[PDB]
Amino acid sequence: MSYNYVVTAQKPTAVNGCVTGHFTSAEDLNLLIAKNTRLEIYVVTAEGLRPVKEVGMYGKIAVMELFRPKGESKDLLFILTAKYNACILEYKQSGESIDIITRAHGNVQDRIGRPSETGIIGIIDPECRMIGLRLYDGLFKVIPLDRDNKELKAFNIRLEELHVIDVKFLYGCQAPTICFVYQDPQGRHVKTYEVSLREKEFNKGPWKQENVEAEASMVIAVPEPFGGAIIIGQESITYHNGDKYLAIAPPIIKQSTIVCHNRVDPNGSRYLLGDMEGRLFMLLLEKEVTLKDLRVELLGETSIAECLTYLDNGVVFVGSRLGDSQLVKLNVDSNEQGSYVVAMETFTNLGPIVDMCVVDLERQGQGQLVTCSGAFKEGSLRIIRNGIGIHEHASIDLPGIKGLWPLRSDPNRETDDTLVLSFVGQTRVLMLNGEEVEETELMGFVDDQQTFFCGNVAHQQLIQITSASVRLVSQEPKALVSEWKEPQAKNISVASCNSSQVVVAVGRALYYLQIHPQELRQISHTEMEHEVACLDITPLGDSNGLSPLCAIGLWTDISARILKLPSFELLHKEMLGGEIIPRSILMTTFESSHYLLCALGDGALFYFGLNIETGLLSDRKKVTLGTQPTVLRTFRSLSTTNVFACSDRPTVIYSSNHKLVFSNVNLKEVNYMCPLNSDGYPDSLALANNSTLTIGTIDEIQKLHIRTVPLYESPRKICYQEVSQCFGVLSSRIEVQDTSGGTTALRPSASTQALSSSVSSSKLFGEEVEVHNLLIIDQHTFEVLHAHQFLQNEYALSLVSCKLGKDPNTYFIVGTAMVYPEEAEPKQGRIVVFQYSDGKLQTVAEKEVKGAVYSMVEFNGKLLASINSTVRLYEWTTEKELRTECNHYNNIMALYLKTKGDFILVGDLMRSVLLLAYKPMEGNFEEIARDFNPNWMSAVEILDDDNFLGAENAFNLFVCQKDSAATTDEERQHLQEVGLFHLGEFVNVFCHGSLVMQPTQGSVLFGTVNGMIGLVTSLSESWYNLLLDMQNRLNKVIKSVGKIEHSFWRSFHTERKTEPATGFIDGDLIESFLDISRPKMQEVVANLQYDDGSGMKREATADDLIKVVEELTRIHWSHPQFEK
Amino acid sequence: IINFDTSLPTSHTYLGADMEEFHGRTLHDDDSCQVIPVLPQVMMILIPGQTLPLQLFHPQEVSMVRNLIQKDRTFAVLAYSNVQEREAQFGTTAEIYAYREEQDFGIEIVKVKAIGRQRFKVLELRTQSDGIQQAKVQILPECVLPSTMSAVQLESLNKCQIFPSKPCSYKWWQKYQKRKFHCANLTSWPRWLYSLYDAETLMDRIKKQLREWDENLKDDSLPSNPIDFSYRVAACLPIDDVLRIQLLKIGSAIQRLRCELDIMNKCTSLCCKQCQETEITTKNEIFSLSLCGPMAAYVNPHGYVHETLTVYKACNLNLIGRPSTEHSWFPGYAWTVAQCKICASHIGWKFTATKKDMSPQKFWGLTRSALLPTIP
């Protein structure tokens, strides 16, 4: 509404910068990586990268450079933010405490100035005399690196050349000297200037060269002994010094534009070069010592690279914004095989997220987010799920497993060496020696009866419970010593056992047995009102493995009565949920607390508190884990005990802060499970589905599990079609003009590799063409089931999955435009209705519109589409056609379309917002409100009936509102700005994903260019006010890197106007409350006002706000610890 | 055009002898609240960068302007939504650059040439004892937007953002779109959509369409800057007052250029506003006999201002009276009143050359107030 809470669910993953040096220590080699608002610090090791320190800053990082002034023991780090916050940082380690010190800082923005086209360029001279900043056309800013300049005071030198492409400081010059490429009407040139330290002015440089390559775009300063500059253009690479000029134009670099570079060795012999398509090249300076020639070698293919950094041992870090970042190795077979690159590590990058969708939105099972991620060859679908991962160590193909039990054959050995499996009417035994598993026969155990329970028991004996009988077996003699049978020899319906006592149930009859050396005694017999469903004798509390309580489930009337042992007398009767019969009953102690767990066939879980002395319910709470019946088995994690729930969705049950967690396991399906602690698989577990036994160990920390589905082409839009178990993905691939009157693909990709294929028409230089497709993608295997190719020059823009009218089919519906380079505004396009069935995509209907179908939504069983400046409502008739019902002309292009109820939000790239209402009794739309506020808008969403969220230029969010404080029509038709917030990310998609990541109401997720994923949720006014005040107090206590003010960082920002944030709480700031010291928490909450429900505010304690903030942390996915 | 100096119309020589010229730097802060004097008789909708010629005979108007010449020299022109009720919510400031006062025969006349400078919203309107109106005004900012890609551009691609200058070849524009909007792949929209919101591309489209209607615009008469270009075309477009007020409301050059392109594509005919059953002229006839453009403000002997559009040919008009060179806005031409044949409304005048050598020999001056843009 008017009070919103915005928090990060996934930190930005895209890399915008990478530098190497000695920041942590003079003897460490570091890799520093910039990820927008995050700085990652690694120590380069022979094995790879050791994460050492990650920090956030209150700014978008635009410059990141290491340097060493004279008298400094190790490197310092210069950062400039996009909002012109400048700082110098020092790494300080004291034992195991790591702090980023701010040595100098200040804001270096000029009050007037035109930001340059090539953007911010920051450079440091090789003598560390000064930082040079190119922020504005016409000016070069110099910040003296003198020790006294701790405010980073700077002076500006005028630069006649107003269109600078790139600039560097040269090496080997008597005075600081810049070298730069610029353009003017007479062409593109390169020039130098000396910086006069006394005059604070430019002096004529040592050399210049006019009319260089028209696309010269990159300057590289070559160190001594050669000095000079390398200039990279699109077809050529030149070298320049005072009296020296070299030029090469090798064919090998013809095809793509070089856009990044990196120096390999200190003397400049070799540079790495990356082009926009992932080619990696080596630039070699040949020495005859004089520079004689330049050579370029293609080393291989890498992810498209924004930044390249050579580390050591032939290892290069590839930073990618369009794809996954990588650690790559240059091979040593150069003499015989030539120079080649081999990937050694891949780092997840979700960016750009151009669209996403949520699956399993219901919170009974946590939902998953699927994102259209990357572009070109790096294009991919990313499936993100939060859960407990299991590391699989072994897989065994045994079908039909009905039970799993750990056993120790040798009494002397602590580790389990045997795994016993039950099958219908059969039991098998597996012997575990290290990682070797062999089927064997255990003497004294029957193989012709299904085993209900198998385990080690007191008196150094083993016990097997079968429907036929209860068997006690000696360990050292390895033979049967006793057996128990029902008096009529009836089968045992349900069985429960522990080290000392066994309770078994036949029909309604219940028998209590105790284990004695070489003996089994029937202590008690009982009858029940209803058929037994489940039994538990787990020995909770302090006893010699003795339980005085027996838990039973009754089939005729569902119930969980608890009986005394050996009294066999009910002490409590539990609530009956309904007809569904109880499947599993478990008694477990978490921490020092005691609870009773009951599972039902419907998959409902009821947990009731129990007291060992009284054994009556403490609380009745039902949690739905899965539709399938759940089985409960206790397992030990660390010193605590946890319960694993086997069902369609396997679940682990935790206990933190004396509460009951229910975390998901990242496994498809588990029917049975048992702990397994063997010499080869210590502290592990064994799982079984219908076909397979798996031995594995739990990750021990809930994490985000991301499945990458590579497409090798650009994903653009995605929708989930549940009834079909598939996703629809619009995609595009680049093809090049063929010599044979056609176009050919650059590589195979999802649209050329589909199981089945279709096309829109059978129709038949080096120019690129975009070819668009609809991909159908299986939601479980992610196979490309089908690919439909659109018409030539047809651009696919919008995608929906839905039902329309009275038709029970679900369709994929795509909106298009016909794009011709000559025609600026599209005059032709169509809406295509597809059906996916029989593994085929069928064109069910088609509608020709006279323009671009920018957006589409299903509206009340009808299709709402935006064509050019018009919004049109279509009805789906029983003849399977789209019939126009009505049509609304706007003075704006309806790029953004969102609906709630009968309301329609229409948006354009200029931030023009229009609210429309469909009038059913008029069969037409009515304009309710509008707001024109020129600014680039990238996405919009409806929060509720009166509030609308959008993202707009310079990385901001805004909320605007249909005011209820109005009686005039002019007031009602005018939207109130009520929310402004500098997010620092560019939003491409908003989507509602309620409780997917399960004080806050509602849930809007957004995906961004940098791969960051955020959540917006609503606050009441009382929570916003408490949280706004807590921010201002937190801001006086939290150490900001670079000493940037939070209020300044979050202020709404454009190049023309800067304004304080309002209507938004920074959840990332609020959550940092949990990390400050106890004294600091209490100064934060001193004089704070904790409005409890009563309306009477009282003084807040630290413990109040700890619980409040901890609860806020649970609304979203937790963030991974960077270092170890 | 032969023997007609297209720079004469803008001079307003009919106003009289050389007028004193003032160079003014007065610009109010954006969103500032200011009180500005309003001349009562003026009824035109002024657009920024548009010259307004005024002749004032009433003592109160003459005194206010003389007092105005000292100080800012800025007066407020109100865009009246309702002329009869004097209802205006928006207006443009006008700054005097030329002033002359005539006291000959004891008759006091003030002649002024003023230029529109800043758009504003009418916070309040008050009438003073002199009868001059003082308007409480909120300055409306000129919204200047960064490039669409500036937020999403890759830093690696930043180097390629500046590109070699065009020799308006079609191949060059394709190259401009691919390089300028390459980072569109990071967004949810295609490069061609961003081109629809790109100022340079939009101005080129307006120039091409104008060149087709007026091949005589061989020179780059239009201003290079998007804001000045948008204001120049808006002032010259022959459109109804409600459309002109909507164009005045626009605060972004990109939006203004898009609205102008839409009007140019949609409108092909001009008709009498009264009857609406007479087609006076067509877009092909429209031509610029002035450097400023096809339509400009000119002041009559009685101080009334008419925006006059120059067309080679006009139809369904009746000529009344005898040709006169007196107070002729275009020197070397005589004017005869032209009335709509059906309703007798005064659409404008027919201008006839006084010399055989002059080209064009005949042209028509049509008042915007008497014309309604018609969409086929």
Ligand SMILES: N#Cc1ccc(NC(=O)Nc2ncccc2OCc2ccccc2)c(O)c1
């Ligand atoms: N400097 C300058 C300069 C500025 C502007 C212009 N032209 C214009 O605005 N419209 C223009 N022109 C030529 C032919 C037709 C024209 O209107 C088309 C139209 C007709 C009726 C209704 C609405 C639009 C110019 O030709 C030069």
Ligand SMILES: Nc1cccc2c1CN([C@H]1CCC(=O)NC1=O)C2=O
């Ligand atoms: N004489 C007279 C009386 C009343 C109105 C008007 C006139 C002359 N005139 C126009 C005629 C066209 C021209 O080129 N200059 C003008 O000033 C009028 O609009």
Ligand SMILES: [Zn+2]
């Ligand atoms: Zn008429």
